Amino acid sequence: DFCGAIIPDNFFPIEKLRNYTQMGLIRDFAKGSAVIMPGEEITSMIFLVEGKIKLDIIFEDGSEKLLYYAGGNSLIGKLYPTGNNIYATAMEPTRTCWFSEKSLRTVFRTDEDMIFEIFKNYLTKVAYYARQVAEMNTYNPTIRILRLFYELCSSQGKRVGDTYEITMPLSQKSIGEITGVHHVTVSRVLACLKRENILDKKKNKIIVYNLGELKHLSEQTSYYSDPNSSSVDKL
Amino acid sequence: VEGLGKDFCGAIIPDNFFPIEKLRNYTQMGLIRDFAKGSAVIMPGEEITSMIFLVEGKIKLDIIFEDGSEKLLYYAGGNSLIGKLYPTGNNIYATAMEPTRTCWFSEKSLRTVFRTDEDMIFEIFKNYLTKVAYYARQVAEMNTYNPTIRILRLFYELCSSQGKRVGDTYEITMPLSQKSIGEITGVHHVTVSRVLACLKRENILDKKKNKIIVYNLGELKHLSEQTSVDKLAAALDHH
Amino acid sequence: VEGLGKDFCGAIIPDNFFPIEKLRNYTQMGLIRDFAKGSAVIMPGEEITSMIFLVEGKIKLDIIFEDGSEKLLYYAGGNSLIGKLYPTGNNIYATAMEPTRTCWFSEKSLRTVFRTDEDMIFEIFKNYLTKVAYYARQVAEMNTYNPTIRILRLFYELCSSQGKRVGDTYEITMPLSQKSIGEITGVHHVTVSRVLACLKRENILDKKKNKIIVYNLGELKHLSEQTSVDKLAAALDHH
Amino acid sequence: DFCGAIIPDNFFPIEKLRNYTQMGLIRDFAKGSAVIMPGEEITSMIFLVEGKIKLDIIFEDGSEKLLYYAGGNSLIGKLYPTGNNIYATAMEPTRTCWFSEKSLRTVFRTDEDMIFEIFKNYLTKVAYYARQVAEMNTYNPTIRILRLFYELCSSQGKRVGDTYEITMPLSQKSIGEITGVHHVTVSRVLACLKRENILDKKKNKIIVYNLGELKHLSEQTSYYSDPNSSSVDKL
Amino acid sequence: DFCGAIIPDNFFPIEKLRNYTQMGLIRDFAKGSAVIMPGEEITSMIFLVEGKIKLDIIFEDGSEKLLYYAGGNSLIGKLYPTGNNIYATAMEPTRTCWFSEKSLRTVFRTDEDMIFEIFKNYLTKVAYYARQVAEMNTYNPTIRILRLFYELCSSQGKRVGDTYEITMPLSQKSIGEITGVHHVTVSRVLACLKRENILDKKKNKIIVYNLGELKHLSEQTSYYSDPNSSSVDKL
Amino acid sequence: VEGLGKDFCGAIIPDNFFPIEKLRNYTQMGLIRDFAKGSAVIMPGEEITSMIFLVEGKIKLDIIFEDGSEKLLYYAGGNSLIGKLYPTGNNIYATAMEPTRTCWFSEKSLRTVFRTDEDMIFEIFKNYLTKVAYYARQVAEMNTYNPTIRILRLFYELCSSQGKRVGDTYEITMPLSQKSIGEITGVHHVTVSRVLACLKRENILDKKKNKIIVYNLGELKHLSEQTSVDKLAAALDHH
Amino acid sequence: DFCGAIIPDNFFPIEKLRNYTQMGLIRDFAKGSAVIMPGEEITSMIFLVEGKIKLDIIFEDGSEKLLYYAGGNSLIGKLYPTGNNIYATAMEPTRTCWFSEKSLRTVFRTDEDMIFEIFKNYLTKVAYYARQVAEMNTYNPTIRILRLFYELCSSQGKRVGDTYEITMPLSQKSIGEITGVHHVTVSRVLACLKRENILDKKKNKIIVYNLGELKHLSEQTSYYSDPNSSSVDKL
Amino acid sequence: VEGLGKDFCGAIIPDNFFPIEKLRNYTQMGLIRDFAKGSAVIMPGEEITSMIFLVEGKIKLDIIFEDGSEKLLYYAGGNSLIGKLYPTGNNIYATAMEPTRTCWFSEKSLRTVFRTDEDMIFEIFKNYLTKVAYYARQVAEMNTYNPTIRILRLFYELCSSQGKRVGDTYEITMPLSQKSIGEITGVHHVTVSRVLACLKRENILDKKKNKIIVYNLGELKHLSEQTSVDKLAAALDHH
Ligand SMILES: O=C(O)Cc1ccc(O)c(Cl)c1
Numbered sequence A, D, E, G: 001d002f003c004g005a006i007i008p009d010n011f012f013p014i015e016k017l018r019n020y021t022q023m024g025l026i027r028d029f030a031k032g033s034a035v036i037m038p039g040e041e042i043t044s045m046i047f048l049v050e051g052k053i054k055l056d057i058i059f060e061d062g063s064e065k066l067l068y069y070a071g072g073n074s075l076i077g078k079l080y081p082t083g084n085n086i087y088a089t090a091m092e093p094t095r096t097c098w099f100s101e102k103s104l105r106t107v108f109r110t111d112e113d114m115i116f117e118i119f120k121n122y123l124t125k126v127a128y129y130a131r132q133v134a135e136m137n138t139y140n141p142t143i144r145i146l147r148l149f150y151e152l153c154s155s156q157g158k159r160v161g162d163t164y165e166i167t168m169p170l171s172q173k174s175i176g177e178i179t180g181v182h183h184v185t186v187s188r189v190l191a192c193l194k195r196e197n198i199l200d201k202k203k204n205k206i207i208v209y210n211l212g213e214l215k216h217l218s219e220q221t222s223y224y225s226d227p228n229s230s231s232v233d234k235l
Numbered sequence B, C, F, H: 001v002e003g004l005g006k007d008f009c010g011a012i013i014p015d016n017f018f019p020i021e022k023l024r025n026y027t028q029m030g031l032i033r034d035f036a037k038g039s040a041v042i043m044p045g046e047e048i049t050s051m052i053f054l055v056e057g058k059i060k061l062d063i064i065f066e067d068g069s070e071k072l073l074y075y076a077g078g079n080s081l082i083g084k085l086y087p088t089g090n091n092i093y094a095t096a097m098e099p100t101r102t103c104w105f106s107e108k109s110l111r112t113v114f115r116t117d118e119d120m121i122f123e124i125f126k127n128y129l130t131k132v133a134y135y136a137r138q139v140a141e142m143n144t145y146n147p148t149i150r151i152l153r154l155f156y157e158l159c160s161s162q163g164k165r166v167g168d169t170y171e172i173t174m175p176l177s178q179k180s181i182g183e184i185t186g187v188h189h190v191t192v193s194r195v196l197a198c199l200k201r202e203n204i205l206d207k208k209k210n211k212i213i214v215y216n217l218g219e220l221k222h223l224s225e226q227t228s229v230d231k232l233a234a235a236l237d238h239h
C-alpha cells in the first residue's frame, strides 16, 4: 500500500514460528539495548516474540538510515552475511528467539510448512524494496542523460566505421537544462561515458564508440508498443 | 567469478543474483518451458505462483506501474532464480533477451525437491536474502525527503507536550481538523486523509474528532525524525 | 492617506485598490444591495456580470479552486471597486466582513454613467491597472521553476541545430515520440501530452509524428530560457 | 487554461482597435529595438498592429523576468505610472499605435464599445495574474507558520489579561520541521511577529499579544464549513 | 580598529551634550521598549544619557540586521528622513534627550563647539561604514566580470565604427569559472550589460557598444602605477 | 533633478551626495584651489582637516588599504562636499577627473561661515546623514558571515548556563584556554587572541585565566545571534 | 612548496632507472591511451622514460579526481594492490618501462643504490599527501564537535559511577552555531557518539559513557604546553 | 587480524600501517632505543635519517606547522615502521604513549639487512605503498576548492583562443598584468605572484611582460578543470 511510502513496518508476520521457540535460543533485550550491534555479523533468523525493534542501516560515511520496524511475530532474515552494516535496537522490553541454520533444519524437519512461510516473508520484503527503488528511480537523472544521447544518436547518428558521429554543439549546460540535472551529475556522467569508451562529448561533435552499451545503460522500455502487449495473456 | 552485475558510474546493473547451479539437478521435478528471443516469460496481468529457474539464456525483468510507466528491476542469466512463488503487489513484465530455457517450480514441486535435498532450502534463502540486501540498501542510500512526515512530526510534538499515558498508549485531548493539519504542514487535505488512514491502520496513531490516540510513540518519534527525491510525489506519480 | 494595504514581514495585504470616491455620485444609476456581516456577496458558482462598488463596509474576496482549496485575493473597503464585469475563468467567493452597502453596475448602467461623466472611464482603467501591476509583480517576484520548460528547451535546441526555415516557420525533420520526450526531460508522458497540446494551440510549435513545426522560434527560445515553487505542481495541485 | 502556467501570451486581442489607428500615433520598431526602454515612464496604451513584443519586468536587484508576449491585436495597458520598471522588445519588425488618454477620449467618443473591449482586456490580465499568485501561494510558508501559531493558541492558548499564553517549548527547529520551512524564513517571521507586537516565541512559553492580528494574517478560510456553502446560490 | 569588524559600538561619544539636556526633551524607556518603532519617521538627534540601545535596520523583505549599539553619551543622528526603516530598542532602563532642529539651534547659540562635536560623530560613522563597504566589496563579483570584459576588449578589441568587437567564444560557464562567480550572477550581469547597450556577449563574438561606460563601471584603479604616487606629497 | 547617482544592475554609483549650492555664497571665507585633470586633490598620506567644497568639476574618491589595494568610495560633482574635517582612520586618494575648482574650509573658516549663516550647519548635517544612511545600508544589505562570532556564541552559551550575576556583570568561573576556544570554533589561535582583546577593550567581556567576566550580556547575546562575504577574511586581506 | 597546493607534479625523479630498462618491459602508449585502465589491477612499478601521464583516482560513486601528473623519470609505485581504483592516461606519445617485483630484484642485485632511490620516491609522496591531509583537516568539523564535548566534560563533567554527566541544555542548533558546522554533520556525529556508547546528548543533560574514547577521538595536542618543548632537542 | 585502524563515524584512525613482524629478526643490525611514556621519540627540529621500527609499545605521530599548529598523522604499534629515512619538508613530533622499545635503522644498517634478507626491501615498499594509498585517497576524497585555479583557468582560456604553437609550447602574445589577473579572478595580487612563480618553476607556463609561454597545455587544461575546504586558505593558514 501507499502506507509503505511512510511506514516500513510489520512485514509478513509468522505467528506459528512461536510454536518452535524451543528449537531456537530465547534472548531478552531491555529498552534501548542493541539487538544487533553496529558491525556485528549476524548468522541467524531472529523471531520477535514480544516487543518492538527498530532496524537501521549504517553507511560507510557514518550516516544511519531506518530500514524498518518489527513487532510481535516479525522475522529478521539475516541468516548469512549481507554486505550491509545493520544495527537494531529494542525500543521496549523485547523477547526474541534466534534460529541458526542448524536449528532451522530441525524446525523444517518437524514442520515443512515453515519453509514456505519464510519464503513469503522474504518475498514480501523483496517486493516492497524493489518497488520502492523503481518508483524512486522513475526519473533517475543519469538515465535521463543517457536517454538523450541514445535518442540523438538514433535520429542524428552518422556511422563512421565502428563509431557513430553526431555533428552538433551540445553543451553540458544545454544537457543539464534539457534534462533538468545538476551540472555536477552531468560532468560525472560525461567523464564516466568517456573513460569507459562508450561516448565522448566534444564541443561540436558527439562520438559514440559503443552504441550497444549506451543503449543497454539507457534502459529502453517498450511493453506498450511491443506486440506482446496486443493481448492480456501470452499467445 | 562474476558478481551480481557490472557497475556503470557508481551504479550496479544486477544481472546475476545468487545463482543456484545445483537446481539443475532437480529440473525433472519442475516444468521445462522454452522462450524465444522477445517472448514474454511473465506478462503483467499474469498470476505467477512458481519459482522460475533459468537453465540457459537471459531474461529482462521489469515492473509495470498502474499509470503504465515501466522500470527495470533486474536481469537474469543462467542459474538465476526468479523467486515469484506467491502473488506480490507488483505487476511484472519479463522477456527473453535471447533463446531461453526455464524450469518452473510450483510449491508442490519444491516440497518434492526439498524432500530429496534439504540444502536447497537454504540456497533459496540465500538468494532471497541477496535480493533484500541489495534493494533495501538502494532505497536507504537515496537522498530522499518525504513531506508527509511533517504530519507525523506535528503529532509527535503535540504528543510530547500534551500526551497523557493510558496503558501502552498516549492520549492527546484536542480537536485538530485534517484541513488545519494540511495548512500547517503545507500538504493537500486529501493526502492528509490518506496519511492519517495509514497511521490508524498500522496502529501508530488514530486521529479522532476531539482526541488523538497514539499507539506507538517510539515508532512515531523515530519515523518523525526523518528527511533530491520526494517520496510522496514518487508514490503518487503512477496514480 | 492610505495606500493599497498594510505590510507584514515583507508582504502587502491589499485592502484598498485604487478607490473611486466619485462613483458615489452615480449610485442612482446602479442597483444598491446591502449585506450583513458573514453574508455572501459573491458565491462561487454565481455568474457575475457587474462591477460592484463598495459604498460602506468591507469585503473579503477569495478564489475557490476546483479541488476545493480556497485562497484570499484581496480585501475591499469603502470606495473599492470589484471589476468583475464579465466572466473570468475563476470561481470567486466574497463575504461581507461587516455590515456592507454595495452598488452593482451592469454594462448598461456603466454606459449611462460614462454618458454623464467621461472621466469615470479612466478612473476604472486606473483601478484595473493597479490590480494588474500588483499581481503581475507578485508572480514575477516569486522564485519559481517549471519542469515543463525542459520540453521547450529540448525543442529549441533541436531547432537551432536541425531547423530549416520555411516562410516564418522552422521545420525539424525527425520522429521524436512523446514517451521519449518525457524520458529525456524527466516529466510524465501525460504532462508532455498537455504541454505539446498547449504549444500547438498557442501557435508556438506543433509536434507531428515525423516533423516538428516551429511557428515562433523567438518566443520558444525566450520561454525556454526560464527557470522554491514548482509551477507545474502548483497548476496540477487543484486538478 | 493550464497552457498559461507555461505560456503567457495573447491576452484578449482587440482587432477592432485597428480601425482607430488614425486617432493614435503609429510607431515602427526594428527587430531587437526597445519598444519600452528600461526606466522609461509610459503613459499610453500601445496597440500592436503587426509583429511580436516580449515584455519583461526589471527588479531593483537588476534581475529581469518575463511578464508576457504580445502579437497582432494585443494591447499594452500602461496608460498611467505603475511602480514597475518594465522593458519591452520588438522581436521582429513591429508596427504599433500609441494612444494617449486624450486620443482614447476621441476613440470612445466615436465608439463607446471600445471602452468595454479594453475593460475585458484588463480583466483578462487581472484574472490571470491573480489566479497565478493564489495557486503559487497555496502553500505560502509564512502563512504555514502563522497558521501553526493560531491553531496552538486556539486550543492551548491561556488568557492572561490582554494576552494569551501557550505553555510549551516549541523550538524554531521544531517549527521548521513541522511546517517544512527553511530556518532562515522561520527566524525572519519570528522576528517580525515579535517587533510588531503580535507574538513572542520564548523557549518554554509562547505569548500572543495580538491574537486578532495573528488570526488576520494567518488567512483563515471556511467556505466549505460555513453555512453559506449549504446551497449553490445565495439564500 | 579590527574590533569594528566584530563590534559596532560606541561611536564618538559627546559627554558634554549632557550639559544641554534642558534644551531638549528627556524621554525614558523601559527594558524592551522601542526607542524608534518600526516605520517611525524620526526628525531628532537622540542623545543617550544613560542606558543601552540596539539599533537595527529593517529591509523591504521583512529581514532585520544590526547597525549598531549605543550607550552613555552616544548620539543617534537622525535629524532628517533617510530612506532606511530603522528600529531601536532599549536593552535596559534608558534615559534619552531628543533634540529637534529648533532645539539644536538653541544649543549651538549657547555653545558653537557642539556643532563640531556632532560633525566628528557623523564623520566617525561615515569613515567606519564606508571603510566596511570597501573592504567587503574588494572582490565584488559583478566588477570581476566587468574587469574581464574590459581587459579582453583592451587587448583583443577590434574597432568597428562606434563599437569594438572581440572575436572569441567565451561561454557564460567560462566566465563563471575564470571569475569565480555563480552562474546566476553571470546571467543577471550579462542581461544588464545587453539591455543597457554596453555590451552584448554572443556565442562566438563579444560586442562592446559603450566601452567608455564599461570602463567606468569596471572601476579601474591606478594610484601605484600613476605618476601621482612617485612622491609621498603633492608636487 | 539628479539623485545620488546612476544605477547599474542593482547598484548605485554615487556621484552626488547631498549638494549644497549655497556654500557657493561663502567661498570668500575659504581657500580656493584649482586642480587639473589627473591631479591629486588628496594624497593617501596627506593629513586632511578641511571640508572640501566642489565649485566646478569632478573628483574621484578612493580609499587605499594598507596592503596597497585601492577601492572607490564615491564621485563628487559640482556642489558636493567632501566632509573630511578631521582625521579618520582611512587613507584617501582623490583625483580630479576634469579641470576642477574647489574651496577648502578649515574649522575656523566654518565657524565664520556659521556666524554669518546658521542654516549652513544643518545643510552639512544633512550631507553627512545621507552618507551614513547610504553606507550603513550597503553594509547591512550584504549577505555576510563572520566566523569570529562563533567565539561570542560560545561565551554567550556558557554565560547563560554557568553565569552568576554580580552587579551589572556575569561571572563565569572556569578555565578555558584561547587554544581550546580556537579548536572548538575552528578559528586560528591568533585570531582568537585578537577577538578576545577587542571584547575586553570594548567592555563586552574579559576572559581571564580562570574566570570570564561578562560586562554586557545583552550586547553579547545579540552580537552572538548573527551570521557570500566572510567579514573576518575581508578585515584581514589588507594586513 | 606552496606550489604543491596547486600542482601535483614531478615527484622525486629517478633518472638512473633509465639505465636498467632492459631488465623491465618497455611499453609505448599513444596520446589518449590508457596506461592504467579503470579497474585494472597493477602489480608493477612503471617508469616514465619519455612523455606525460595524468593519474587519477575513481571513487565508488563514479566520480574521478586527479592524484598527480608524471613526466620523464617519474615513477608510479604500484607494485602491489592498494584498494584504490586508479586510472592513468598518456597525454602525449609516452614510453614506459614496467618493473615486476622479479625484475626489480634483478635491478637491485646489479645496483643496491636503486633501492634507496625508490624509498626516496615513496617518502616524497607520503610526506606530500600526509601534509596535505593535515593542512586540510586543521579545522575538521567532527573534531570541533568532539573537542567541544571534551572541554565541557573536563570543566562541567560530574562523575556518576562509570559515567560523567553534564547538566545543561545544549541544543544541536547551539552546537552548530558555536562550532560552525552544518546541521547535517551535527546529527550524524551525535548519532555516531550515541550508537557507539561514547556519549548521549539529551535535551537538558549530556552523558558521557566513555570519556577516554571521546578524548582519544578529539585529538588533543599539547607540544607547546608539554615540558618536551622546553628545549629544542631531547633531554 | 587487525587492519589499519578503527573507524569512527566514517573516518579511520590509522594505528597500524603495514606491520613487518620480520624486522624483529634484524634488530641486532640497528640501534635499540627505549622511551618512557610521554617521552619525545622525534622532536620537531630533529633531523631524522633512520627508519624507526616499533618492537614494543605505541607512538603518537604528529606534524607541527610553522604557525605552531599541531595535527595527528598516525599512531604506531608493535611491528609498525616509521619510514623517515631522509629529510622531508615536515616537522614531526612523535611521543611514546606507553613504555616503548624501538630499533633505529640507518641507511647503512638497512643495506646490511638487505644483504642478508632481500625480501625485506619489498616489505618496506609494501609499507610505504599503504601509506601513499591511504593519504592520497584522503586528500582526493575531500570536497575541496581552490581559488588559485581560476588563474590557471584564465590562462587556459586565453591559450585556447589566442595561442600559437611553437615547438612543444604555445605562445600568447599579450600584456596582462598580475594586478589585472587578480582583479579578474578575485584573488590578492600577492597570491597571484606566487601562483605565477609556481607555474614557471614547474614548467607549466611563464607569464612575461608582453608574452605568455605555455610549456604544458594539457597539464594546464586539466589542472584548470578542477574545483567545503578552500585549499588556498589551508596552505596559507600556517604562514
Ligand atoms: O541485513 C541486511 O543487509 C538486510 C536485511 C535486513 C533485515 C532483514 O529482516 C533482511 Cl531479510 C535483510
Ligand SMILES: O=C(O)Cc1ccc(O)c(Cl)c1
Residues within 6 Å of the ligand: A123, A126, A127, A130, B061, B073, B081, B082, B083, B084, B088, B089, B090, B091, B092, B128, B131
Ligand atoms: O514480483 C515482484 O513483485 C518482485 C520480485 C521480482 C523478481 C524476483 O526474483 C523476486 Cl524474489 C521478487
Ligand SMILES: O=C(O)Cc1ccc(O)c(Cl)c1
Residues within 6 Å of the ligand: C061, C073, C081, C082, C083, C084, C088, C089, C090, C091, C092, C128, C131, D123, D126, D127, D130
Ligand atoms: O474574478 C476574477 O477572476 C478576478 C478578479 C477579482 C476581483 C476584481 O476586482 C477583479 Cl478586476 C478581478
Ligand SMILES: O=C(O)Cc1ccc(O)c(Cl)c1
Residues within 6 Å of the ligand: C129, C132, C133, C136, D055, D067, D075, D076, D077, D078, D082, D083, D084, D085, D086, D122, D125
Ligand atoms: O506596467 C506594469 O507595471 C504592468 C503591466 C504591464 C503590461 C500591461 O499590458 C499592463 Cl495592463 C500592465
Ligand SMILES: O=C(O)Cc1ccc(O)c(Cl)c1
Residues within 6 Å of the ligand: E055, E067, E075, E076, E077, E078, E082, E083, E084, E085, E086, E122, E125, F129, F132, F133, F136
Ligand atoms: O537612519 C538611518 O537610515 C541611518 C542612521 C542610523 C543611525 C544614526 O545614528 C545615523 Cl547618523 C544614521
Ligand SMILES: O=C(O)Cc1ccc(O)c(Cl)c1
Residues within 6 Å of the ligand: E123, E126, E127, E130, F061, F073, F081, F082, F083, F084, F088, F089, F090, F091, F092, F128, F131
Ligand atoms: O575620509 C574618510 O575616511 C571617509 C570620507 C570620505 C569622504 C567624505 O566626504 C567623508 Cl564625510 C568621509
Ligand SMILES: O=C(O)Cc1ccc(O)c(Cl)c1
Residues within 6 Å of the ligand: G055, G067, G075, G076, G077, G078, G082, G083, G084, G085, G086, G122, G125, H129, H132, H133, H136
Ligand atoms: O595506486 C594507489 O592507490 C595510490 C598510488 C598511485 C600512484 C603512485 O605512484 C603510488 Cl606510489 C600510489
Ligand SMILES: O=C(O)Cc1ccc(O)c(Cl)c1
Residues within 6 Å of the ligand: G123, G126, G127, G130, H061, H073, H081, H082, H083, H084, H088, H089, H090, H091, H092, H128, H131
Ligand atoms: O616525516 C614526514 O614528513 C612524513 C612521514 C611520517 C611518518 C612515516 O612513517 C612516513 Cl613514511 C612519513
